[PDB]
Amino acid sequence: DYIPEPMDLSLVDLPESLIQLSERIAENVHEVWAKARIDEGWTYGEKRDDIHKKHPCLVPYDELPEEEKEADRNTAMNTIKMVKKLGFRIEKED
Amino acid sequence: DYIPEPMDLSLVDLPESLIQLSERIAENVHEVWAKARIDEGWTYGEKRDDIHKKHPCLVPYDELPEEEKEADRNTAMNTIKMVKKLGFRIEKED
Ligand SMILES: Cn1c(=O)c2c(ncn2C)n(C)c1=O
Numbered sequence: 433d434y435i436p437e438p439m440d441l442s443l444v445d446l447p448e449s450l451i452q453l454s455e456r457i458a459e460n461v462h463e464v465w466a467k468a469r470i471d472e473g474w475t476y477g478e479k480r481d482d483i484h485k486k487h488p489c490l491v492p493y494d495e496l497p498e499e500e501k502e503a504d505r506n507t508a509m510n511t512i513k514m515v516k517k518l519g520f521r522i523e524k525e526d
Numbered sequence: 527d528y529i530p531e532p533m534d535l536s537l538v539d540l541p542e543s544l545i546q547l548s549e550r551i552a553e554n555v556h557e558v559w560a561k562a563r564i565d566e567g568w569t570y571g572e573k574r575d576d577i578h579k580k581h582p583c584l585v586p587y588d589e590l591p592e593e594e595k596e597a598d599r600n601t602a603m604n605t606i607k608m609v610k611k612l613g614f615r616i617e618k619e620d
Pocket residue numbers: 461462465489594597598601
């Protein structure tokens with residue numbers, strides 16, 4: 433029986449200017465991931481198949497369902513919130 | 527026909543102190559996702575099923591294969607490099 437105990441991020445505040453770019457960050461995070469898989473012989477498939485190297489998320493980011501892009505933008509902001517929580521400043525450059 | 531064309535992050539340089547925390551960031555990023563999913567009725571399954579909300583990655587982070595932990599650390603780091611290349615400063619708290 434699995435019960436996740438994440439560290440709480442709900443009070444971590446990021447620059448609005450950073451949240452505004454979360455779509456661009458998720459797309460590129462997706463693209464970097466897809467390049468690596470395709471460079472190692474993965475191809476599009478209906479379900480995740482490690483033994484044959486097939487994955488359904490190997491399509492352009494823009495063609496993903498919006499619920500997935502939503503998950504991906506959340507993960508991108510959760511990552512940076514965890515950075516700030518581990519004690520790093522995040523500031524827009526002048 | 528899909529050819530990913532990500533932005534090139536190879537020359538983005540992150541503080542080592544932040545790279546040292548890769549596994550902790552990836553673990554919690556995974557844990558926040560699992561908590562969100564389980565709160566919405568998702569449970570473990572052997573393959574992802576959006577309609578019946580089953581997902582194979584709904585296990586503790588520590589129990590994931592090393593190959594997936596590696597992909598998780600690289601994406602956390604790719605997310606942060608993308609943040610730096612969009613013009614934000616990441617520095618240890620002063
Ligand atoms: C589909 N997918 C993954 O499966 C994945 C990932 N990072 C780690 N993993 C496992 N990214 C960015 C991703 O898009």
